[model samples]
Target: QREKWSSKIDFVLSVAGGFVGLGNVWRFPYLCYKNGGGAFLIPYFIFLFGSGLPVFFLEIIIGQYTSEGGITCWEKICPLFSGIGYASVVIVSLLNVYYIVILAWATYYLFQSFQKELPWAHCNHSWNTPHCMEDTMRKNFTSPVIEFWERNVLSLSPGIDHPGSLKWDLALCLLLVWLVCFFCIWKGVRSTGKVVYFTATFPFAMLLVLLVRGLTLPGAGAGIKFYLYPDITRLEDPQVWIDAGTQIFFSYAICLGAMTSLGSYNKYKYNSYRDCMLLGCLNSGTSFVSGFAIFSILGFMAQEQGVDIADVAESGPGLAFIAYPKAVTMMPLPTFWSILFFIMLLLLGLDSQFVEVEGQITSLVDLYPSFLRKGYRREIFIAFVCSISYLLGLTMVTEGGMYVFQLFDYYAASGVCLLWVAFFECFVIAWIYGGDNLYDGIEDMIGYRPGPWMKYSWAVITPVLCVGCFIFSLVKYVPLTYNKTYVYPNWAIGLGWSLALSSMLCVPLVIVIRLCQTEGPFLVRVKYLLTPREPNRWAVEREGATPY
Candidate 1:
């Protein structure tokens, strides 16, 4: 039997746990900053309505309907386009591999925080370069934090082509993160559901503490203004719209089989529309408010260094590893707060990372439940996956690992692939399997069919939004770079293209292979494969018990 969540809160907390990680700190805040600040929220809300909410509802219902994990669920519903599951599982694996490195760095920093002085706080270490100094007085000073990140944490590998040996400290921390991920998921949903009780909510406490602390800092207003002060002009650029639109998919973890995997753990009669609305709101609200926590401290840093907050800002790794760490050093009881901050970072990423691991592992368990679900088998499988994931991730721990990490984050984890996949998902359910069945299926579970709005959104608005963003993303492409300086070698760029294709091609590759394997007149076989299976047409058929 599938393990159900202990309570509704279990599913909600676990989902909220997974979806609200780096998008808040690592992505959205900077996305807001670089775009039109407060004005970015307009397009964000538009895309949220146009795509995020509808696709979100579709995936959750798909999961609860089939009681299947990412892969098999698609097979159960529409066997012809079964690659949706593989597409999602592969994407989650990319996320699984790259995301843990964020935790490893957090773990490394957490230990460093307990020192008598924060290691990144000063230029006294042997790793410090001749350029290292804390004074913003210099025209282009390399502060201790920057030096610590580039020199100490990453060890300065020069370029993507020059990947040096792995640093053991980072490796040890990476191992620790994998170990933690394994234990959290070794027992399946039961363990991870409980872990979310703490990891999911603790970040709120830290965000509040950081905001309260940040607001008191001198330049905090400037930073918040920089975050919120909307320039209407920025909206005119299609790029801003593209960023805002694509961000919703990433932040929501849509098209990644994440919603489907997590939702499959619900009780058959679970009111997932309820969970979808609440958790969806929570994810967006947390990001919006968490910006205040980020920008306030950034504002303080600006004042401390006597520069504009925008001048002090660094997006991407700069925001995580450098800007915030440096800001924490300026606080009183820097060690105490520093420890708290890194722990928050660890928990934030830890919850998200392990849950995704749960999604991917649960896929395997469902695929071969007879073996994988047996006593100790799931545990063994989790360890196997974690070990393999850790091994695959070793390249990221090398001196040029940050370069590799960003490259994956750019191509492998980017939105272009997700948009196309999501389009097909809507196309399958609304157009292929037909809309009435989906509506009736959910109605059987939730006791009322969704109104015309949802069906129309699913058929029209959502896919159009996905295609528009996909096309726009292609038109506005830029080459990958690190620190706006280290350009990737041609070979590295070629490898990056391969990484992007790795997930995208899974959809078509599986389709072609499946079509080739079938023996009927090709056009004749398409009808049956594209058609929904006999049992999957209704919620009761798949779920067995409907009445509460």
Candidate 2:
């Protein structure tokens, strides 16, 4: 049977599995340390309150009320904002496409973990040696770490940095990643339901193993302190606050249609309010818990290598690929720990990959309901998208892939397009769509009206915070280098901005097109998209009937 989530627990676990991606393991601890240790929590919680949780609740309510998946739900809810959800679904697909490439890397590294020494640790390059890390990776992965940290952490290109590896190895690994994701998402929620068991639980087990080992390392205490010690000053820095808020949004995978699409598959009777709470708790919990898991290992590495945590954990890919894995090679039972950690990471990335691709698939299925619903055509749609994603993933398998990945990762996910689209989403929902009515719907569903706190967030707080952070990010925006020496030219930035806006601009333009065709002003379209069909009439009637 194509299963639905068997219970509330299952639903929560599955959604968490989707939201908690490579960031928890690879990026969270470093971000914690970078943003003033424990003090980063101040901005993080602020964003969660002013933005994260409220938006999550809003997405869930919209998803549940519409009861359609992905863009389908948006089309029903508010035709004007159709473009916003559409952009989300598309960006989600793009995220999935590259995510498969990362999964392939995890799979490659997991297999390589059988080796006693981590591959990225030693340069092993000689005058006559063809399989030299210096020649291949150092010249290729453009970062200072790649050029400077030459002997360690081969920039993840395609396969294990194996000597004399066949060209086909990376292609095969990419295929496997896509195939795994395709199988997991083929049946939609039913498939996602089963896979999440491993996705959610396996990382914790790996965390336990790594944490135990991390604590025993000599400088483990220092690492833990570095990760947790709250730097009050960094919290005051505008950049720190921007980074924290952005990470919270990115980590939770909001305004991107993935969560909304996931919620769409549940039973009509399902309490999305409760689901919102579970999802919110899991997202923050995983980040905090993983901090311990990752920093423990970092502590050990800092002790042994005598390197600052700042030097070791400079970026997401660097921490996982270069720093920690190189450090793992020094530990007792090193190979075992390395294998355990990489495998866990592979599962985390794989689960997220499925959810993003599924969001895209959901949108397509919703559009062509006549052909896709309850039949072979649905499977065909799934396979088609999966096939394209698999093929697209090959581009990232090249020596130049890390550079390309950064471009998409930064521009598509956080660049002007997504930020503006997210802002627009709140604007449409709160102002254009009758904010009072949306709250009234929430009141009906949860038996408690969404209070003024929520009212302020959706209307004022979220938009201002997102807009401010995005605008400020421009001042701090650091361009990434490719090939260690080559700077990303100004054109790349322009191109990235263009692509992001194209996707984002699709929203307002679509709404305008729909409104003109319907012969109504944009305001009327907002009212129709936002107001609940059955209840709005009831509220209006009830209000009208009361004696003055």
Candidate 3:
């Protein structure tokens, strides 16, 4: 029997938990501050409704209606675009490998947080250099927390060419992360559904507590102002719009196939349209609320450092591990706060990791159910994937691992690849499969057609917006760097492009193959390839006709 969600809320929380993670705590505030503070939210919401929500709703509808996983679902929709499914699985697999390393880092920090005096609280560690300064940002001086992260935790090598020896501590933590992840989803949605009860909702509780504590701290107002105060001129920059679009994709977890796979487990009667809108709002809403908690703490940090907020603020991994930990040292009961903070980070990363691995597993089983569907077979398959992923993740635990992590994070998961996948998805479903057809499928399931706005946005606006972002990303592209000093070598940059293209190559590769397999004039071949392979039973049963 195919696995199904036990209840509607279980599925909702499962996807919601996956969507609201590190992206909220680590990525969103920094983007907001960097783009235009409060002003960024304008374009962010515009794209959220215009592009992000449409793609999300469409994917959920496709998966639930088809009752197929990521890979096979596309074959049912448009046979030629099956490659998009493969591309999404590959991206998720790559993401699964590096994402575990982040949890490993969090676990290591969580362990350190137990100490009475947080290790990063003072500058007396063996790793500290002459340039190490604990508080009060100084030019040419690195903080002790930064040194500890680089020299002690990461033990980062000079560059990618020198991978150096593995950090035994992180390797152990990574092994533990994989083990926990294995048990959580080995039973499929049965396990994941129950886990989301705590994993999905706990972070919000922690955030609320942290927000209350942070707002009481001195200098919190200034940081909040910096995060929300609009810089009107930033709206003119194309980069800001691109950032807004990118954040919408990343925050909503779109174009990754996990959302599709999650939706596939729903019962036929499930109200997916409402759930999609609710989850979409939850995603954008988390990022919005998180900005207050994140920037409030950074405000206190800036005051403690006696520097401007920009001087002390950093994004991605640095903000979480270095800048925030240093800020924690200034609070009363620093150890207590540090422990809670890392615990929150750990939960955030773990929940997202569960869904990424699940998406990959779902695609595999759906593609080869005969071999994989027997008893204990699914469990064993998940074991093999996590085992291989753990081995691959070891590279990130090496001395040069941070460099490789930066590469994967930048290329495999962000910007161009997502935009590419999203564009083709919208193009295939909207332009080729026909918008009215999709609307009818929704009506069969939900008992009402989507408003005209939803149909037009899916048909025209969303695809055009995705292509514009794709072109802008290429035009504004800059070489990947680490720490603003270590420029990636030419070969490394090439490797990054290769990662981005790995997913994109699927579009044209399948297109040519499908074209060759079909016989007739050019238009005939195109139409044949665009035609869906499996008929929609719900549409056939209730509507008695194809909308096309």
Best by lDDT: 3
In angstroms, the error of model 2 at 402 is 0.6
Minimum summed lDDT over a 10-residue window in model 1 is located at 187-196
Each model's lDDT: 0.78, 0.65, 0.78
> What would the per-residue lDDT of candidate 2 be over residues 20-52, giving only the tens digit for each residue?
877677656655655556777777888888988
Model 2 misplacement above 4 A: 1-6, 30-42, 116-167, 187-199, 230-239, 267-270, 313-316, 370-374, 474-486, 520-548
Runs of candidate 3 exceeding 4 Å displacement: 33-42, 136-139, 187-197, 232-239, 330-332, 519-522, 538-548
Query: 2 or 3: which has the higher lDDT?
Result: 3
> Which tens-of-lDDT digit does each residue in 309-416 have in candidate 3?
766644445566765676577667888878877887888888788877877887888788897979799888889999998998888889988898888777777767
Q: Rank the candidates by lDDT, best first.
A: 3, 1, 2
